[PDB]
Design a protein around this ligand. Structure first.
Ligand SMILES: NCc1ccc(C(F)(F)F)cc1
Ligand SMILES: NCc1ccc(C(F)(F)F)cc1
Length: 330
């Protein structure tokens, strides 16, 4: 079997993408952020502290005839940005674009950090990293992808994110009409629980390609591209007036500049990120300083190929017994 769902940017900057997901019987539809950097399916719910909910659709297990409390199970998560949430655990039926999993662990948020409360468009997260990162205690739970794997025609899902436009998450098949050329596959390390791979180098604008190994993770749940200080400095050196700002916490650039593209290597292939994708607009309403979509990973400890990079490609997450990542131009 297969599944297919449209994902939509939450705002005009593509800060995140939401995808409708059906939970419970009868269906309760929540718009979740699909996150290949985490492994917990957690949702706003009728158990979430009332003051911490501001416009989200909530999951109500008491109205679902298939929901079962997972006795004694708890969860607690902390994301690399400082976000966090925690609560208890139900099992229920969960469907994404026609693909149904029974007995999926649904983590009901009792507490959420402020950054979730202020994002009224996001009802929760659907984690798609490897199940070794799931935070359910004392019994670790499987992700939606791991639970569906056996029933999928092919143990893959693909991410086709749009630039200021809707996109598609497909489960169980590769849409050969959705990309140009060939898909280039590259090896993945699962040792940290991420879709971790090694890029073969980079280029700035029309410059020479620099062959160098950049280890990083493919993360649909991170907005920007976080790369080593040396690479990021070489990119912003090509933008007149660009500078790293401590008060802003990143590279900013004059909103009147035009940005060069950024190329990253996948084996012998090249994925080109158009310069417009790197513009994240004014740092404050009315400002003439604009925020850059390529930032240093020095403070983070790992390089992150976030939406900025991934939306420039058709991306295959191949969850075969030896996992691989595929990239194609589109
Ligand atoms: N999108 C989930 C996520 C967020 C942060 C990180 C970090 F910071 F640990 F790399 C990994 C995964
Ligand atoms: N990387 C996971 C993640 C995704 C989204 C958010 C936001 F946007 F809701 F704050 C926080 C953390």
């Amino acid at each position: 079997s297969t599944g297919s769902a449209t994902t939509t940017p939450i705002d005009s900057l593509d800060d995140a993408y939401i995808t409708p997901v059906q939970i419970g019987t009868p269906a309760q539809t929540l718009n979740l952020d699909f996150d290949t950097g985490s492994s917990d399916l957690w949702v706003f719910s009728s158990e979430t502290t009332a003051s911490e909910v501001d416009g989200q659709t909530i999951y109500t297990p008491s109205k679902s005839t298939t929901a079962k409390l997972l006795s004694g199970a708890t969860w607690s998560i902390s994301y690399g940005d400082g976000s966090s949430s925690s609560g208890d655990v139900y099992t229920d039926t969960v469907s994404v674009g026609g693909l149904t999993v029974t007995g999926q662990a649904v983590e009901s948020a009792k507490k959420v950090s402020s950054s979730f409360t202020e994002d009224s468009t996001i009802d929760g997260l659907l984690g798609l990293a490897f199940s070794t990162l799931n935070t359910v205690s004392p019994t670790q739970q499987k992700t939606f992808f791991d639970n569906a794997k056996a029933s999928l025609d092919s143990p893959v899902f693909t991410a086709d994110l749009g630039y200021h436009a809707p996109g598609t998450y497909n489960f169980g098949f590769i849409d050969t009409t959705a990309y140009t050329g060939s898909i280039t596959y590259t090896a993945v390390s699962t040792k940290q629980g991420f879709w971790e791979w090694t890029s073969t180098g980079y280029a700035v604008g029309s410059g020479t390609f620099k062959s160098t190994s950049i280890d990083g993770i493919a993360d649909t749940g991170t907005t920007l591209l976080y790369l080593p200080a040396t690479v990021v400095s070489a990119y912003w050196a090509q933008v007149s007036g660009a500078k790293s700002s401590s008060s802003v916490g990143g590279y900013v650039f004059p909103c009147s500049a035009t940005l060069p593209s950024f190329t990253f290597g996948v084996g012998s292939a090249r994925i080109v990120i158009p310069g417009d994708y790197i513009d994240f607009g004014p740092i404050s309403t009315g400002s003439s300083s604009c925020f850059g979509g390529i930032q240093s990973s020095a403070g983070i400890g790992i390089n992150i190929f976030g939406d900025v990079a991934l939306k420039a490609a058709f991306v295959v997450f191949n969850g075969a017994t030896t996992p691989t990542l595929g990239f194609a131009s589109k």
